[PDB]
Structures are given as C-alpha cells and as structure tokens.
Symmetry: C3
Subunit: 282 residues, 3 copies
C-alpha cells in the first residue's frame, strides 16, 4: 500500500477545510447512475484531480468528481465515477476514498453498480438488492486489506458474513413496496470478477454454479474497506443485461447497452436511493 | 503495462523491413508441437532475442524464434516457443507478440497447446477442438487487458462469448472427417490455471465440476488479446495425459510424458493444421 | 523472486555455523500452536530479525523465531510465527524458510495451522489430517514457484497429487488410535484463500461446493516449495470454528476465538505432534 495513515488524514482535513459540508452518508454511483448527483441541494463539486492524494482518473471520460450536498434530508458525499481494478489501479487506490469518507465522519456507505444477470429470473431493468457477495479476486490475494493492518481503521481479520446491513435491506424491501411498483425488488448474491473483457459461456456457467445472481467488476473492495471501518453498508445492482448462458444465442454483451439500460430504467434507481435516505438512521 | 503503442509499432515496422514476407495467419505452437515449423516453405527465421522489444526467452532451452513462411497456400508467421505466466512474465509481455502480429497485417490466430484431460471420455493422443475457455486467472485480475485501453487496438470491454470462430470450428470438424480418421475430433472447454506445479486430485475435481474438459497454463491470454484486436481465432489442445481424478491411482503427471505424447501423436496435429489452412478465408 | 540461490545458501551456512544443531524435521507452528516449542530440549532460539535474508516480521506481535532442538528423539527446527500472503509478503518470501531448511539438511516438513471448518461433520476442537489441498491463489498466478526454476532445488513442473505423504497419514491415523482418544481423527481437503477478511456465507458455500473441508490462509505455499525440494510432507488443521454457511445464524468469525480454541484443545495437537515424531523415519 502506497498510502500512510497521514495521507488519508491530510486528504480528509483538506476536504473538511474546503467545504462547510459534513457528510454522514457516502454514495458511490455505478455506471450510468451518475445522474443521482442532480438531486443534491446546496451541492458543491470537487474534481478528483484537485483533491490531494486522490487517484487521478486516467481517461474514462476525464469525468471524476466528489459532490457534497443534501439528499432527501441527509448530508451526503457522492462519487460520480468510481475506480476499477481493470483500469490498472491497485485495490488500495480503488478503495482510498472509502477510508477518506470514514475520516470525514461518514457512517454509512451506499454502493450502486450495473451488473450482468446470472439468475434467469432477472430481466433487463431489474434492480437487485445485494444480500451477499463472492469475492473471487480476494480468494487469490486481491483484497484491499492486504498488507499491514492499521488498528486506527479496524481489526486484522474483519468479518464479512454480515457485510450488507440486514436492517437496511428490510427497510429497502419495505420502501420499495410502500411506493407500489410493478416489478418486485430482486435480491441476491453479487460476484466480482476483474474484467475488463466480458464472460464466456463457460465462465457464465461457472459463476451460476457458484451461486452468484449478478456479475460486475467493482463494489466488493469498497464494501470490505467500509466494513473494516465500521461503516453501515447497503447497495444494489441494476441488471443491464442477461449474460449469455448457452451457445444457442448469437448476441454479445457490450458496454454500449449497459449505458443504455442505465439510461431508461436509470432514474428508477435514482428515486429509490433518494427516498431510501429517510430510512437511514443518524 | 510497460509497452507504449509506439513499441508495438516499432517492432512491427522492424520486422516488416527485415522480411519481404507479409503474414496473414499467425500460429502459436504449443509444447512439443514446434515441428510444425518444418512445413513452411521460403522460411525465414528470427530469434526472439534479435527482435526489438520482444521478451527474451530466459532458459526454457534458449529456443525462441519467429518463423515467417508459407503453409499450404497461406502466408504465415509461427511462434516456436511461447511465453508463459509461470515463467515470471506479466501478461502484457506474454501477449506482446499478438499485438505485433495485428500490426503486421495478420487477421487470423491459430493457437495450439498440450493439455491434461479432465473429461473422462478423452484419451492420451486425442485432439480437442477448443469451443470455449474458463479464464481463472482473469477472474482475479490477471487479464492481459488490465490497464488503460488503447482505442487503436480495440474497445474497453470486448466480448469473449464468441472468441472461438464458429465457422472455423465447423470447417475443422469437416476437414477432420474429409480426411477419414480413426478417433473422432474431440471438442470442449479449456481452463487456464497459472501453474507451474501440476494439479492435485482435489483441484482436478474442482476443474471438472466447473465444466472444463482440458487444462493448461497458456493460450487464454493470447486469445483475449487477439479478439480484442479483431483477429479470427481458432485452436486446439493435444491431450498429453489424463489428470488423476481419484486417490486410487499411484501415478504422477510429469513434463516428461507431455513432451513424449507430443512426440508420437504430434505430427498428427501438424498435418491437421497445415491442411486446415485451406479452410481459412483471406 | 528477489532471492538468488546464493541468498538461500548464505542463510543456511550462517545458521549451520551458529548452531551445532543439524535438524532433520522442520516444523511450522500455526496460530495458537506456538507452545509446541516448549517441548524441545537443548533448545536454541534465533530471532528471525537476526537471521540473514529472513523476512522481518512486521507487527503480528514482533514474535518471530526459529527454534532448534530435539523433539521426542528427532533433531528439529521449529518456526514459531509463520509468514502470510495477507501481511503483504510475496510468496517467495513466505516460503523462503522452506528452501533454507532443505539446505540445512531437513528431509521432512510438518505443517500445522488453525482453520475454519467447512465440512458439517466437524466440531470446534477437532483435528483434521490433511489429505489434499485446493490452491485457489495458485490457479491465478500466486504460486511460490512462479519465475525461473532453479534445477538445484527441483524440476520446472513438480507434481502435487501426492503432496501429503500417504505413509505418514497412515501412521498418523494409527498413532491417534494407539493413544485411544475420544473424538476420531478427521481427514480432508484444505482450501487456501488469501484473506485477511473472513468469508461470507456465499463464499462459504462456494468453498463447500468445491469439496474443501477446512479453510485457511497459509500452508499450501510452504507445501508446494517443500515438495519441489523433495521433502516428505505431512500436516493437519485445528478446527477453531465452524464457518457460517446459512443466513439463519447471527454470529461472526473472529481472530479472538481462533486463538481461544487454540488455547484449550491446543496442547492436544502438541502432544500428537511430539509422539508422531517417532513415526518419522530417518
Ligand atoms: O455481463 C456483464 N459482465 C460483467 N460486468 C457487467 C456489467 C458491469 N460493468 C459495466 C461496465 C461496462 O459496460 C463495466 O465497468 C462493467 C454489466 N453487465 C456486465
Ligand atoms: O495435467 C496437466 N495440467 C496442467 N497443464 C498440463 C499440460 C500443459 N503444459 C505442458 C507443459 C508441461 O509439460 C506446461 O507448460 C504445461 C499438459 N498436461 C497438463
Ligand atoms: O473461518 C476461517 N476462515 C479463514 N481462515 C480461518 C482460520 C485460520 N487463520 C487464523 C488466523 C485468524 O484468527 C488467520 O491467519 C486465519 C481459522 N478460522 C478461519
């Protein structure tokens, strides 16, 4: 890890002295979900590039910013553009923001992402509440906590079986119903794979056989660092496509559609997140 | 990645100005399949060591060369000796040649390798057409495309579900029959594991349970980079041994036998490849 | 790999000239099993920090030492405190001691560790004889033999299907009975995961579906290097906890209990190891 405790501290204090905002809830916007930033009020934008120690967003579109504001009665800080292992960043950079949030005073992390559906019951547009995850990269060594542990953040061996807050998941399922929606709110296991190339049929079958319901290339690292910090964690995936699971089909998964699904059924997640803020204690 | 676009370009131009040959089909010879180089005509050999930017073959036997020539009516470039992740090379070096081939004007990549048979229906000497692959290293981060993407080669998120050209696989199965052979042409999923040590019984069972038919320590990376490039891809594995899948057996897998199987039933693959060249469009 | 053959040699010769002891059996003590060092006679302690080239134990408790002595009629060398991939050490440092032992004249390696039980038949306190292992990190590239092979230690492609000496496992099962004990001696497959965070329910299910019986974050690397060396290998796991495999449960795995289980049923393993020394040929 190239960061010392001092680095996270200096970044936090810099942000704290450059904004009057004092966030409680940190929100990481997934692909095609950045619009969520338009709902904040008293918004204050910071480009990643101007924040000390922040990983500088190479060329996804040069759009990387931290937005502080209020979302439905709660002090928030949103990440529009998140870092991925596939871009070359080691996991300790990918999750650097998370530790910064903790030092800013955040106690809750909401993570969102787009994902391929592995469970056949899913349909494009569906929203999957994350009940659990399978950290394939972590099994091999790619775990954001690798390296000496700093007691100031947490313990050497944090547990992850209760990573996704049960209370929030319940309140989430409730909220979704209180709103009265067509499709039900899906729930399941998210499996992380490094990417960036999409899965083959054989691989799709492997992930299904392991019990995963949705597949993506992010999130798990941020969740592990958040939990290591003591943060309350809740999140979901926007199923942007159904992964090909048999050779009959003659269609390919593309980053184009993922942003397209995250175009129509996108605002659906946005509203759900804003409303869900009232369900977050303080 | 330690290579800049310029590096691949300079290597291509160097080769292009040192040979009159202009290859269309690149062929990577697997273990004990190097003999395939003896079939080229108007052959011109280049030691890896003399080609700018090429990874220098440590000590597999110091035998690493790029051979340009004609194979059954087609301009080829063959790799005699391929790079493996287990030797210490990062994946961006392992696949460096592939991007060079694309800049040389190659539009087809034929990959061959020796592999352990996981499917019980296989026998030593069998030839397995590769229909799909399981990229275990890729799930964890070891994917040759990790790092910033260069649009000149391809897209950020290339698909792999159609990696192995369906047309060539069909024409391959046809060719094999047109020849009238004893054993049928096997077909299945290739699973890549890093190695270099051989699998345990428990591991063999894992790979079988995942749906893999053959196991090796190469190929998948080259295939992913080729596809990212737009190359047509086809290949197969020479089953050199049947992996031990139960504790009853008292025999061990050894690099000795692998080269031995690749001694008798070796030329069988060689001919098949030469003849298959006529089935490759232009 | 940052070590040259010379480095292992110089470390061996340094130890050989600083102790009259000439070990035959090397023993690696797992978590909460360090007490085994109290049974040696004519004991001579070396701090890891004073041994040339040894990885310096960061801050697990600053307790890292190599103890030479005699254990029940056999010249031993014990590692009190072992290195883990999760602490940041690359595998070639984690396994550095193993190659040193081989140069000291050791011909047998006994590895012990604490592990989470995946097989439901297990209970806290149980002892599991290791019959086989699943090297998840190894599938992805994290194998201690990655990099050029040195013929002086072993072959390029060593087999692992017979890693755990069948004779010792038999003599172990015998010994356990000759002693007449309540609980039977368990036996099964050990799966290595990098850690340091504990498994989620979904992950627990994956590991079970793969056929693993116990889960830990060490051992496999040392075993592979030992075998590559020609060392006889035998070992076992102390089940310190039963991994949560369903959402009903409301308890979390913690490094606290692991050391606690390794407190009561700890000496049970210690005696078993001492007595088992008589079963090790010479
Ligand atoms: O089928 C899939 N496989 C793996 N990841 C995704 C995702 C998630 N994100 C979306 C984004 C690509 O469009 C990249 O960062 C991956 C959506 N569908 C799939
Ligand atoms: O049983 C097996 N397991 C893993 N790889 C192979 C291979 C393939 N290559 C062959 C070569 C060793 O002889 C090394 O680079 C692995 C053949 N049989 C097996
Ligand atoms: O449930 C488990 N999952 C993964 N490893 C362990 C272990 C083994 N060691 C023990 C030690 C933590 O207490 C760390 O190095 C892991 C015991 N129980 C479990």
């Amino acid at each position: 890890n190239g960061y010392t405790y001092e680095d996270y501290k200096n970044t936090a204090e810099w942000l704290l002295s450059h904004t009057k905002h004092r966030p409680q809830v940190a929100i990481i916007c997934g692909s095609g979900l950045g619009g969520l930033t338009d709902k904040l009020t008293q918004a204050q934008i910071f480009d990643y590039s101007e924040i000390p120690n922040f990983p500088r967003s190479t060329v996804p579109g040069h759009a990387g910013r931290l937005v502080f504001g209020f979302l439905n009665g709660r002090a928030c800080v949103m990440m529009q553009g998140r870092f991925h292992m596939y871009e070359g960043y080691p996991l300790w950079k990918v999750t650097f923001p998370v530790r910064v949030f903790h030092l800013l005073g955040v106690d809750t992390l909401v993570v969102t992402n787009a994902a391929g559906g592995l469970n056949p019951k899913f349909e494009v547009g569906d929203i999957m509440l994350i009940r659990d995850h399978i950290n394939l990269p972590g099994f091999s060594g790619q775990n954001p906590l690798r390296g000496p542990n700093d007691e100031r953040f947490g313990d050497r061996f944090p547990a992850m079986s209760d990573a996704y807050d049960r209370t929030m998941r319940q309140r989430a399922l409730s909220t979704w119903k209180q709103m009265g929606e067509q499709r039900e709110l899906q729930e399941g296991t998210y499996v992380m794979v490094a990417g960036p190339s999409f899965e083959t049929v054989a691989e799709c079958r492997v992930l299904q056989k392991l019990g995963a319901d949705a597949v993506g290339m992010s999130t798990v690292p941020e969740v592990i660092v958040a939990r290591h910090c003591g943060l309350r964690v809740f999140g979901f995936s926007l199923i942007t496509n159904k992964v090909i699971m048999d050779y009959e089909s003659l269609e390919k998964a593309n980053g184009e559609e993922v942003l397209a699904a995250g175009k129509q059924a996108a605002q659906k997640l946005e509203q759900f997140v804003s409303i869900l803020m009232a369900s977050i204690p303080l």
